[PDB]
């Protein structure tokens with residue numbers, strides 16, 4: 156399944172033939188950093204990497220980028236061209252992105268572009284900064300939309316990575332109301348290609364209640380994002396364990412029984428109530444503590460195993476494929492070749508199937 160551009164129907168995503176599909180993928184970061192390209196191409200051929208992602212059973216790649224790669228002549232700076240990647244030589248970050256998107260389509264994978272950082276220096280709480288205005292943000296989203304218009308390999312956009320304090324959901328103040336910003340951006344994107352799915356993340360605090368950046372969608376029920384083209388919206392949340400931040404609910408004595416309460420509250424309810432599909436965009440852990448291992452086992456079950464629920468479940472993209480992620484580690488090990496079959500083992504009940512070639 157997976158043919159053509161997708162659309163929502165209740166809490167599910169459906170391909171063009173109306174067959175339900177499930178995004179069960181991985182994050183492959185690099186384009187958002189100051190290397191201006193996905194990491195690991197210093198040890199592997201990109202195609203050999205894409206083929207291995209497919210082999211492990213992952214069907215979608217969330218590809219983080221920063222507005223820097225849209226500046227004229229921006230080139231990658233961490234690729235090795237000996238006996239590999241010979242065709243990426245002399246190409247700009249964008250042209251290298253076109254190659255990755257193209258091969259991914261052919262082998263049956265899909266891509267979701269994620270505006271991870273305003274610039275390669277770091278993330279931002281708001282969707283704009285003094286150096287990267289809101290208009291650049293929108294022009295850039297429209298440019299990428301235009302660039303891949305007609306190639307269903309790119310199924311949709313993750314508007315802004317991890318909006319957080321001081322951002323608000325529904326407060327009505329245009330300078331911090333992420334809810335209004337997402338509609339503003341989403342509608343600009345849909346004006347270029349109205350078949351793209353629009354993935355909108357949450358904030359951090361809502362009603363004095365704090366949660367992971369990008370994961371607080373508590374205001375969504377009361378203050379929905381409303382787009383010009385219906386059945387394109389998918390809410391998104393992020394959730395992590397102690398390897399990232401020793402949140403307090405991990406110290407709760409009833410842990411992990413308290414978890415589904417937290418999850419239901421902040422994002423699950425949109426799914427449970429069949430309002431719209433929900434995508435856990437980032438989640439990972441080094442699995443060093445027994446707590447993260449229990450957290451992962453628990454969470455994997457909450458997201459609904461494919462054997463039981465099929466496509467009527469939560470969409471997900473784990474973090475990350477890269478082994479060079481500070482406090483989460485990744486599926487590959489430090490050699491960019493050996494799989495961490497153990498961590499990979501936990502995600503098995505929620506993996507789905509590879510899509511149709513594009």
Ligand SMILES: OC[C@H]1O[C@@H](O[C@H]2[C@H](O)[C@@H](O)[C@H](O[C@H]3[C@H](O)[C@@H](O)[C@H](O[C@H]4[C@H](O)[C@@H](O)[C@H](O)O[C@@H]4CO)O[C@@H]3CO)O[C@@H]2CO)[C@H](O)[C@@H](O)[C@@H]1O
Pocket residue numbers: 184187188219271316317366367368369370393395399400437479480481482483
């Ligand atoms: O992008 C390349 C870069 O990625 C890093 O991995 C990051 C992800 O990129 C990022 O999206 C994700 O965001 C984290 C953030 O890093 C944490 O510091 C933050 O912790 C917050 C917490 O959310 C709050 O609730 C709490 O109150 O405060 C703390 C901060 O003090 O939580 C968000 C998640 O919502 O985190 C990933 C892992 O760090 C890699 O680390 C880096 O090596 C890569 O180069």
